[PDB]
Amino acid sequence: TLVSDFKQQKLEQEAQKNWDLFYKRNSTNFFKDRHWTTREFEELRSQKLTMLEAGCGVGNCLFPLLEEDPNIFAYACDFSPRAIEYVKQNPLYDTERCKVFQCDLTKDDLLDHVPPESVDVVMLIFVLSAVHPDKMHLVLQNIYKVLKPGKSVLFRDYGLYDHAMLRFKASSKLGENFYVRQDGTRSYFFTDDFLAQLFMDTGYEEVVNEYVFRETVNKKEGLCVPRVFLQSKFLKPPK
Amino acid sequence: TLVSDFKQQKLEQEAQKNWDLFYKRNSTNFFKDRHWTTREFEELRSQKLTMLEAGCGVGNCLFPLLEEDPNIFAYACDFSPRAIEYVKQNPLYDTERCKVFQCDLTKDDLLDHVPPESVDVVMLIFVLSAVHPDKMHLVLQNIYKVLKPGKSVLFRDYGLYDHAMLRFKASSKLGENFYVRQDGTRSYFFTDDFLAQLFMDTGYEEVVNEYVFRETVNKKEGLCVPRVFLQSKFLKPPK
Amino acid sequence: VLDLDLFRVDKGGDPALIRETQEKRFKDPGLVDQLVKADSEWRRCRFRADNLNKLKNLCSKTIGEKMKKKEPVDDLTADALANLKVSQIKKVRLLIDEAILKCDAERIKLEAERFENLREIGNLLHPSVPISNDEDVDNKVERIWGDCTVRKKYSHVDLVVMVDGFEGEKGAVVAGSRGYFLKGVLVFLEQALIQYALRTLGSRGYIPIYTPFFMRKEVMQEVAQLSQFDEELYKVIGKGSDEKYLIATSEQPIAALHRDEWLRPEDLPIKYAGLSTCFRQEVGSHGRDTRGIFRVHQFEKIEQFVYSSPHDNKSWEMFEEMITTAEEFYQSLGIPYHIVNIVSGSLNHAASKKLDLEAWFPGSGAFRELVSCSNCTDYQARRLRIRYGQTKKMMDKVEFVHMLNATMCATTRTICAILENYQTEKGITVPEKLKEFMPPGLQELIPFVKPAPIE
Amino acid sequence: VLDLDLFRVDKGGDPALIRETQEKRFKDPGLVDQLVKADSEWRRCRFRADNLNKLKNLCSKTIGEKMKDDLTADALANLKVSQIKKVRLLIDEAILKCDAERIKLEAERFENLREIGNLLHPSVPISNDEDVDNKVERIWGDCTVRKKYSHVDLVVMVDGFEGEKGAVVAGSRGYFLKGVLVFLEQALIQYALRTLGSRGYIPIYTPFFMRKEVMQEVAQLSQFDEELYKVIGKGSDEKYLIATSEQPIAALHRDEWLRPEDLPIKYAGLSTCFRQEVGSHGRDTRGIFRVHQFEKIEQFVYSSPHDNKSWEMFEEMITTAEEFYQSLGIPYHIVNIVSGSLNHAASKKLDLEAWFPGSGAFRELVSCSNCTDYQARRLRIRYGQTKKMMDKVEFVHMLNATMCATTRTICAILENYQTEKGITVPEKLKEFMPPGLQELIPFVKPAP
RNA sequence: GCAGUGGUGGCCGAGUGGUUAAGGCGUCGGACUUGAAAUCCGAUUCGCUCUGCGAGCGUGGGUUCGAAUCCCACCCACUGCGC
RNA sequence: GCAGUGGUGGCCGAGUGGUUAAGGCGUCGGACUUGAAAUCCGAUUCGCUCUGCGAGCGUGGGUUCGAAUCCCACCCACUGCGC
Ligand SMILES: Nc1ncnc2c1ncn2[C@@H]1O[C@H](CSCC[C@H](N)C(=O)O)[C@@H](O)[C@H]1O
Ligand SMILES: Nc1ncnc2c1ncn2[C@@H]1O[C@H](CSCC[C@H](N)C(=O)O)[C@@H](O)[C@H]1O
Ligand SMILES: [Mg+2]
Ligand SMILES: [Mg+2]
Ligand SMILES: [Mg+2]
Ligand SMILES: [Mg+2]
Ligand SMILES: [Mg+2]
Ligand SMILES: [Mg+2]
């Protein structure tokens, strides 16, 4: 049935290694820059807005919004050293606007690099699906302490019954809505209820949490397919 | 086609041996006594009639006519020693009425045992067919000198197209009307013209020479077959 | 053979399960313990040998670079060697050579020992196998078809002579014990059986294949067993010397047909209807009704052979399909039989399960095995290196195909069954499915022309 | 083997004919003189041995009757038993010497006789070069048409041949035959068996190996080293794989007295043949044309030795083969093989050579041979059931002819029936083919 | 069976004593792109304690610090012979 | 493969250390009978210099003056085992 229970332990203990070898084999050429960020969230629209990018990758999510709006300071978090080195070697990088640092969002703590209750917006774009479902609230609590008590957290990631979930063969299933790719990285497909009751258990307040529907079409192969991402915004209670 | 010319020479040089081994294997049980003799020929019917039996076998031709008519003296000629010994050991044999002796009728001469121009009747019953066709006139001349100048010679032997001539396979043929049996003895089947011109070439005179027709029938196998013997009487010219 | 990683416990293996299976087959356990210790030592020896090879390679690379830059004259590192003259690196290479040679000897010994321990270990057992060692008591009868209690007058030993289709004495004069001439009506009947079986298997999707009868020794070792290859196979010798062995079944050359190949998963269920003459050296007579043409040295056999996907329980569905094909064959021939599940102690080393079709011989009053269907899983494919996909994955190990075989029709034994089951008082009635393939005049009855040798 | 009476002038024979025949076969003619001298010395030796045995038996009978070398019966009847034992010792020494001489003479006598070929039929072309003097006796069909591919490509285009994997499994020339070509070979066997069965032949499936003591009597020395595989059992038997089913069929009646009434014995042998010589002579001889293992259907006849019946049966056998190949539509010519290329047993041989339009050559498909009594007297198969006193036995005549070697006939069919879309199925094999293969064998691969 | 030339990875094909076994072709999966793809990114012999190192160029050996490159043997092809 | 009994002529079958290998059965040819036959007479392993002598009883050897008869080996059957 599911993947061997021994193998799932090897996947959990080698999560950072699997993401590091991904950046080794694929360099910065796999993912593409996300220019839809500023438009999608009512924040990030056009003073000194300090931001934390949890799971920054090689950029692709902060460099666009950072060359767009020129009064944003950014913290960058990633547990893979290769991704950090790629972010630093980017020609668009300057220390006066970015502060990149490695931090395993489940084991390490964010206060060792960012000041408490300082960040006004933190982004979770396709980062939480790579974390084991039983260590996600660890990440939510780790980022709960650096958020300004009126600030918020922005989240887009896979949703239930997306096509990518569809495609996976049965030999790639770790559990309910929990799969693994050929390269070792994993994918959890969230539901609105699961994410809601995962954010509520760590002290957040739901604002918007609803699915976003798209489609993928390759004209040459004439392939058009449905896609289901879950977008949301949670807010830290004022008082 | 015909029998090997080498084999025909072996048959001619071993004629006496072949007849001797016949009497060795068959004893006196093969041929049966001929009781038809006295009736068939107008001679031999009921004074002192001296007779020569050329080719006497083991009897079977002189003992019947000799126990029938009690005033007949008989000379017996045969080139096989076994036949002579069987004739002598016959209980019906007495020297006062018979004079048996071995004589090859082609090589030997009859005057060494019988007086010239003495015999009044000589019989040739199935004897000339065992002689090679090119040594028959030898026998006719050998017996021409012992015949009284008014006497005769009696002859019965196979004729042309008899059944026995038919049965024989093609591997048993020595020449025209000339066959050989399994035991080595031979059979020549005479025609009236052949016998006539064979007796005329040696100084005889034909009296009667005509075929006699019988058959043979085995009821159990339901076999009835034609038989053609040639009977004749030749007479030595008086003067 | 089994996968060596099933014994490595540092990998996801478990030798205890191999011990349980080796007990259920009533074979010798402890071979698992010898294997586990040999393997655990071989893993460390392999690590050390790789490291020595890396050091030797790095010495050679450094020497080449020193030479091409025209130089003036084992905790080693890359930079560490970069500070030595060529003579000193060669002095180091000599120590590397000695260590490599002794490690290589130890590793070759450990590999051979672990493999000769893995050689005996039988395949894993399907949970449907009856655990036992008494074949006469625990053979599991599964199904029965027809009337398996009727009795008839003559056994096949008489019937093959009453039809004048068998020459035993002259055969033994020509070939020796058990040699035979098949003649007359029984040659036509054998050919009819071959035509019917080939046509049936071809319509099911099997590819008829006529195999060579001489297999080379290098290849026969990989498809046969120690005992068979020792005392059961004839050896052929030509001019020279001669490493050839007359095949005991067509499953042996057909197994070597896709030897050392990467088979596409699409088209994986390759089905072969093998046709050949088989040469078996063991012919023992347990009574009169096993003589005649029942146990002979030479006979024609039609075999099923299937290469299957190792996933999704596909080889076991294929196993059921093959036994069903043979069952339907003998039902169309009108021969009664039962299906028996063989006990653990009677399976050979490759089989995970074996079914037998045993036909009822009414003139002998016995059950005699006609079909033998086995599922050997990847035990043989691993030995022959017949891989399941065309591409090897980044990290995963190579997967092998499963290989199943099943006799469809051994001609002499099936002729014996047909003769015993179709005898009447005047001759042998021809089965309705074989009348197409018989000559005119032999399409209704094979008449008795001689008296019974017993009478 | 020839009758030893043919070499004895004492009997109705003469070795001059044997010398002239050894010249016609372009073999050595000096064997006849050695044979005649050995034979003439052996007859004397045999006579002396019989006389010594006679004296020994009379000595024994005298001793036995009394207890209860110019010697005679009465002569021994006057001796003390001790004297008879001394005489028996003398007779034993003489018998030992004479038996040594006689065994030596028989040995040499048989060595020179097994190398003199059969007498020739007056129709045989007397010559030694086969390629010019073989009398093409008759033609059938169109033996000049030419077509695109040879069999070496056609067996691959229909996907019925596996040569590389076969050479991996079995070695040089090993092959798998698969698919449509297995069905075609089986159809050929069925058609040949029914054709021969309608003619009065008895089908016979033979053993594939033969004991050496029996194989010697049907084969020559040249064959064993060059062409016969040896089978080894356990304990190291001495069996050989058969090169043709004529070899086991010949031994089926060894040491028998056949009834002349049932003398026209005809058998249709079916077996697998194993040859070692597969030497190649170009591409057109590769494929399944010259292989180590193939099925063959044979004609084997035991005939009366009388009345030219053997030669009438010879003509009948070649006519049966010819009709088989005319019904298949294969063009051929019949060839009278020259005396130089005849085996020892054959007194005449006719080959049927078929035209191969893709190869452009004639290839031998059938070989018909009349061996007369050469092998019958070596196997002691006697004509009559009874022996005559003082008359040597006659042996039957034995004739063999290939009906169909399946691989070569498949090659000929493929080359003669190829079209652009596949191979047309011969009209006479359609009833023996599976449904779907009764009109065309389709091409499924490209030509190599 | 001799007396010549040859043998590279799934296939073709480079290869020059210091490769990363080039380039293709085939196959296989991954794709998160709002500037989606009439495509892109990769992988694709074996082994080990796996971000690396080791082995592998018909198979075995030799020479060399180092061989896919040079030498030898064997095996198998092709070209000429013997048969 | 053992550990017992066996092996006779075209076939059956006697055979007892001094056969003529009995008796049958089958097959094959010869028949000249007047008293023909709803049968009779024979032959029927190999060899030789053939009216005789020699060899041959699964095949080879031994003991004996002499073996088809007694001994041994091998081969092949049948009866019990191993497999
Ligand atoms: N538990 C964790 N702690 C920190 N980083 C993590 C993490 N789990 C996954 N990641 C990082 O999250 C990244 C997801 S790839 C997505 C990158 C980014 N969201 C973008 O839009 O480009 C990976 O590079 C991985 O390094
Ligand atoms: N040339 C010849 N000279 C003498 N006798 C001969 C002979 N040719 C054959 N015979 C004998 O003639 C006999 C023929 S058998 C006939 C015997 C006699 N006619 C009878 O009626 O009984 C044979 O016994 C043979 O010995
Ligand atoms: Mg290549
Ligand atoms: Mg490449
Ligand atoms: Mg190499
Ligand atoms: Mg007997
Ligand atoms: Mg008798
Ligand atoms: Mg003996």
Residue numbers in the entry:
A (entry chain A), B (entry chain C): 27 to 72, 79 to 271
C (entry chain B): 2 to 74, 88 to 255, 264 to 477
D (entry chain D): 2 to 69, 88 to 255, 264 to 475
Q: What are the paper's exact sentences on this?
A:
Methylation of cytosine 32 in the anticodon loop of tRNAs to 3-methylcytosine (m3C) is crucial for cellular translation fidelity. Here, we report the cryo-electron microscopy structure of the human m3C tRNA methyltransferase METTL6 in complex with seryl-tRNA synthetase (SerRS) and their common substrate tRNASer. We show that SerRS acts as the tRNASer substrate selection factor for METTL6. We demonstrate that SerRS augments the methylation activity of METTL6 and that direct contacts between METTL6 and SerRS are necessary for efficient tRNASer methylation.
Processing of the cryo-EM micrographs and particle images of the METTL6–SerRS–tRNASer complex revealed three-dimensional (3D) classes for 1:2:1, 1:2:2 and 2:2:2 stoichiometries with essentially identical intermolecular contacts in the METTL6–SerRS–tRNA interface. Surprisingly, despite the fusion of METTL6 to SerRS, not all of the SerRS molecules in our reconstructions displayed an associated density for METTL6. In our samples, we observe different possible stoichiometries of the METTL6–SerRS–tRNA complex. In the complex with two copies of METTL6 present, these are spatially distant (~100 Å) from each other, with each METTL6 molecule binding only one tRNA, implying that that these METTL6 molecules would function independently of each other. In the structural model, the modified N3 atom of C32 lies at a 4 Å distance from the sulfur atom of SAH. These findings indicate that the structure captured a postcatalytic state with both products present.
